[PDB]
Amino acid sequence: FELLHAPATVCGPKKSTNLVKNKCVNFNFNGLTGTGVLTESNKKFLPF
Amino acid sequence: FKNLREFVFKNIDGYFKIYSKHTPINLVRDLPQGFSALEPLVDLPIGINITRFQTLLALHRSGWTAGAAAYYVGYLQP
Amino acid sequence: SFTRGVYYPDKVFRSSVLHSTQDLFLPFFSNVTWFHAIHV
DSSP, X not given: OOOOSSOOOOOOOOOOOOOOOSSEEXXXXXXXXXXXXXXXXXXXXXXX | OOOEEEEEEEEETTEEEEEEEEEOOOOSSSOOSOOOOBEEEEEEOOOSOOOOOOOOOXXXXXXXXXXXXXXXXXXXXX | OTTOXXXXXXXXXXXXXXXXXXXXXXXXXXXXXXXXSOOO
């Protein structure tokens, strides 16, 4: 396993947890950690 | 011309970023006076330093005669 | 350069807000080196 000065493009981590809506939960979205309720929203996010 | 290509190439911490934008514009020469934000289109973990840049052109066979086009280079500053 | 060279600084989404950030940007109305592909 080589670790040089460059992006580490080989990894093994992953996390599939079941989403729950309208409930105060601790959420972790791809590295963003927070606490609150998750609701369906009408926000038009751009693709990026 | 009838089309405008806008690209931003940056290399930071081993990641190379290409931001792209297509804007159709009719102008004889020079950039149009129009504001366009460039949406990131490619992000690649290259990992190698970039100190020199060279563009690739499509040579039109007649002996080469390149097409009439304008390519603009602007250096990013902090 | 006029007002070109502005790109989205990040994947962060902002709606109807002014955001100030310091990144590598092309200065407004700066001199940009332009070249013609065709040679006469």
